[PDB]
């Protein structure tokens, strides 16, 4: 049973002039929210030594991306939009789970999805102390596989994001979004 579901989509098609929010029904919190970016965010992952892997993404380009997404979401719910890490799930939707030069990487994305974009575009609550691009810690999956005496490097463009939106009521004035998902059969029409 192959689980086709993710947090980030890599190297896929791009929307032509602006970001696109797609869902079989946007009101249905149980149906997937697919984001198709218009300009991609580059992500470089690598393994220098044993027990050391991470991914890097430019912080500014990423955050500026998130904003442009939060504006498109606001076309459906005109309020403050929040991104947050998932409350549960399997590896495929709990982390960025990808193939890097053969190896199985899985990195947590807690710093990719931790922000609040308020009603005026002005967004994130605190003015940021950190100037450097974003570092996602990874781990590799065994499988007892013999050691690799190389430097592992892979280069992917982030194309889109897969989101589920919180449900219920006591949530406040905000619509919250997380990188969850269901399987993606029937996703390609336009």
């Amino acid at each position, epitope marked *: *049973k192959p*689980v086709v*579901s993710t947090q980030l989509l890599l190297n896929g098609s791009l929307a032509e002039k602006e970001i696109r929010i797609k*869902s*079989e*029904d946007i*009101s*249905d*919190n*149980a*149906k997937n929210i697919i984001v198709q970016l218009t300009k991609p965010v580059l992500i470089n992952c690598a393994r220098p030594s044993n027990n050391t892997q991470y991914c890097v993404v430019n912080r500014t380009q990423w955050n500026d991306t998130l904003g442009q997404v939060a504006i498109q979401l606001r076309k459906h719910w005109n309020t403050c939009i929040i991104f947050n890490e*998932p*409350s*549960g*799930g*399997d590896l*495929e*939707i709990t982390t960025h789970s990808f193939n890097c030069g053969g190896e199985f990487f899985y990195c947590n994305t807690s710093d990719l999805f931790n922000s609040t974009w308020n009603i005026e575009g002005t967004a994130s609550i605190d003015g940021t102390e950190s100037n450097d691009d974003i570092t996602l810690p990874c781990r590799i999956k065994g499988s007892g596989a013999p050691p690799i005496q190389g430097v592992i490097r892979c280069q992917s463009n982030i194309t889109g994001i897969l989101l*589920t939106r*919180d*449900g*219920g*009521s*006591g*949530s406040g004035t905000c619509e919250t979004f997380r990188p*969850g*998902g*269901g*399987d993606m059969r029937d996703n390609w029409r336009s």
Partner: antibody
Amino acid sequence: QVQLVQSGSGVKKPGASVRVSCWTSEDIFERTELIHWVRQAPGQGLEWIGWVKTVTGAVNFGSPDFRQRVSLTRDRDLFTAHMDIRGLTQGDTATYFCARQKFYTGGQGWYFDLWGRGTLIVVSS
Amino acid sequence: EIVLTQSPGTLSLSPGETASLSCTAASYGHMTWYQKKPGQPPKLLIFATSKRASGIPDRFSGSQFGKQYTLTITRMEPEDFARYYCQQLEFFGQGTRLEIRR
């Protein structure tokens, strides 16, 4: 007819925790996109607690409180949903139902065709 | 907030006469209906807005007008006297109860 089989009732101390399980026949679990948990306090309505996807294990909740204190999991091998409540309180004394959503195209709404018999949980000192 | 308002809260009829419950939603969205007797789980009646669940008599009927979704039970038989609930996505109405009029 076809049943969703639900784990047994309990009487739990305040603050303690509780697991309610729900399982079914492979042929049925395969046709199932989501398992929802719905509760009913006595003399009250049905309140939606949350859902788990069978395929990815993804979740969602009807309230922050629920999202904090409730964990929804599945074992695709045993065709089984589990709902875990922690830090119980009298406000949790209710009958808990598991319920099924067949795979559906967006815009049909939420319809639950199968339901468990329902598990009574009593929180009292 | 309120997304669903169900009315009436109690409706009294004789068997034979026809009952109509309504459920007025704040937003357009396909309405689902359940029957509910005590000590029993809900019984799915109607989904989409007009579709009839499997093994559900012809006398149950889902209609819509604007944002007002209604359930009609046309030739009331004794078993139909129970509570009824609407559901629009994650939200349930507060429920109408059918009672016998004497």
